[PDB]
């Protein structure tokens with residue numbers, strides 16, 4: 337199967353065909369879902385090759401010395417890693433609707449909001465891995481209020497305005513999994529952030545890439561056990 | 572003028588039209604990024620220094636993180652995070668572009684900036700700490716080797732070609748303090764990086780913003796004492 341992840345013993349991929357771009361991804365990784373949301377929203381011709389993050393092949397470290405996902409690779413052999421960098425690269429290098437505003441200040445704002453979100457993925461990961469949960473859930477609420485304050489001052493539904501933009505796709509994957517883990521109580525003190533979650537689920541690009549709550553919980557149970565079959569959950 | 576505003580200080584008035592304000596600190600390398608870009612692009616600006624140990628009560632309404640640098644234009648728009656401020660200035664103002672508009676090239680410099688992201692954390696540890704100086708020197712050498720490999724693979728003098736660009740200004744402030752921290756032996760095994768440093772010192776913008784050895788010495792001692800006069804060393 338083409339979606340099955342590549343582990344140790346897999347052959348490194350061949351050259352990227354011209355006119356297309358390759359993304360080294362993982363179907364349950366929020367950092368890579370950022371890039372795939374942009375690829376879907378911009379209708380970019382691309383191919384997906386999943387990396388078994390619990391059985392990483394050694395050749396993948398040549399694509400990215402951090403050994404991390406997502407990674408983009410065009411026909412010229414050029415490689416782009418870091419999730420936010422891959423998204424901005426796709427928004428610039430490809431035609432269609434711009435997910436990033438053309439105004440220098442409004443684009444600086446989305447990057448500033450991204451920085452307000454920077455602490456969440458780390459706290460989110462430590463909470464998944466002793467019952468100190470109460471402290472990590474409180475550290476969630478503290479970071480979530482910072483997002484709530486942005487929506488309060490902007491007086492809009494999305495973080496970039498009344499329409500969905502790049503910053504929404506950068507933030508959404510961690511709140512998509514929040515509902516799948518029955519952790520919606522962590523945003524009952526952030527009503528505008530909670531409304532934003534509901535508005536994101538109405539987006540065609542978002543709902544096309546949504547992972548069911550049973551698929552995420554099944555993957556996460558295998559991933560926390562470091563199972564080599566975690567990244568291929570659901571075939 | 573250069574004297575830092577502290578607690579109880581009056582908030583500054585509106586920024587005059589055609590100008591921009593930077594909330595800075597004379598010894599902060601993150602703020603020096605923005606000041607290097609302002610000088611390199613010939614942007615008329617005013618500098619307001621903030622006592623980072625005795626921060627003004629109003630400064631938190633300019634940046635929720637209470638951190639420097641911060642840009643404020645005549646429209647009252649606020650831009651923080653050093654990298655964001657540098658990209659904003661290069662887009663919002665005319666003159667010579669410091670950042671390449673090519674999506675891949677700009678993605679590379681951001682990827683190079685990510686490879687550099689460990690050095691600002693290590694510099695703060697060397698300044699703060701003990702006998703971990705020897706261990707921190709090895710980390711500097713290993714991180715600088717990552718930059719040495721970038722300059723070697725590009726076969727160029729600077730990180731963005733054979734002329735000085737934005738990524739050089741973003742990385743320089745930490746290499747400028749290497750001599751005052753008596754860490755020059757950390758670049759003895761990085762010839763391309765040594766040549767890069769010598770070329771940066773010859774840059775007119777870099778030369779005008781250099782800090783004497785005895786000023787960075789006194790500021791560090793006072794910062795190593797939690798002094799409200801550290802930011803205003805030398806007055």
Ligand SMILES: *CCC(=O)N1CCC[C@@H]1c1nnc(-c2ccc(C(F)(F)F)cc2)s1
Pocket residue numbers: 362364365366367368405460461464509510511513514515517519559
């Ligand atoms: C690249 C893959 C990756 O980062 N991961 C795979 C499993 C661990 C890690 C995580 N990715 N998303 C995670 C997560 C956990 C909890 C939430 C929460 F919203 F809090 F419910 C969100 C996202 S761990």
